[PDB]
Structure formats: C-alpha cells, structure tokens
Amino acid sequence: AEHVRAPYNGKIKFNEDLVHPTRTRHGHPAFLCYIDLSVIIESEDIIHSVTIPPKSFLLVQNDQYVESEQVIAEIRERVRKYI
C-alpha cells in the first residue's frame, strides 16, 4: 500500500457526494474513492491540487485542516485473537 501525505498545511476541499462512506480496518470512518477525485488544499500562499486515484481510501473530511506530511489518503494466515 501507499500513503498520500499532505504537501502543505491548509484546508482540504472535495465533494463528499462523489465518494462512498466506509469503515477502515482501524475502525475509523472514511471514504472509498472509485474515481479520479480532485482534492484541493488551500495553503498560506497558493492553492494546490492532489489527484486521488480510484480504489483508494480518503481519510480526511471536507473543510478539514491538515498539516504537512500528514497521511490524508491510502492508495490501494489465520490468526486467533483472545481478549
């Protein structure tokens, strides 16, 4: 797997109606992306775009504030557990 990280600080912008809600293997809510979604980060100087390829998890929300180098998306034996 490959992790997409934010190249700048700023505000995430995308249309949440273009993606499908899901629960990740870590128990978090997220979005499933089956298209070439365009995600915008508006930083302190300029506005920058990150292309989200299909079959990828979008871990952030629209209008969320992200920090640089923070994971924002993920491009994508039987064990017994005792509690």
Binding site: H3, R5, H26, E69, V71
Partner: protein, 49 residues
C-alpha cells in the same frame, strides 16, 4: 498500532537520505554508507531514525 508505527518508521527512512543530501552532504555517517564504503540505510536508520 502496527500499521501506524510501521508507516511512520518507513517514512523516516525514506526522508533520511534527502535530508543528508540537502542539508549535510559531508556528514560522516552519511558518507560512510552513501559512498558504499561501509553500512547501509537500514543500519543507519537504527542509529538516527
């Protein structure tokens, strides 16, 4: 727990060489492994990552 820390460790190792190449090209630890004289990135990652 496993996946967040593995990804963090792997990201530190990936960023290790560009930090040396850009900010301390003649660092002694970098010169030993980067030139191929002795040591690899994994062993260096254990020291500084």
């Amino acid at each position: 727990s496993i996946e967040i820390w593995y990804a963090t460790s792997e990201y530190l190792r990936q960023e290790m060489n560009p930090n040396f190449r850009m900010t301390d090209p003649f660092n002694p630890v970098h010169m030993m492994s980067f030139s191929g004289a002795r040591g690899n990135a994994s062993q260096v990652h254990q020291l500084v990552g």
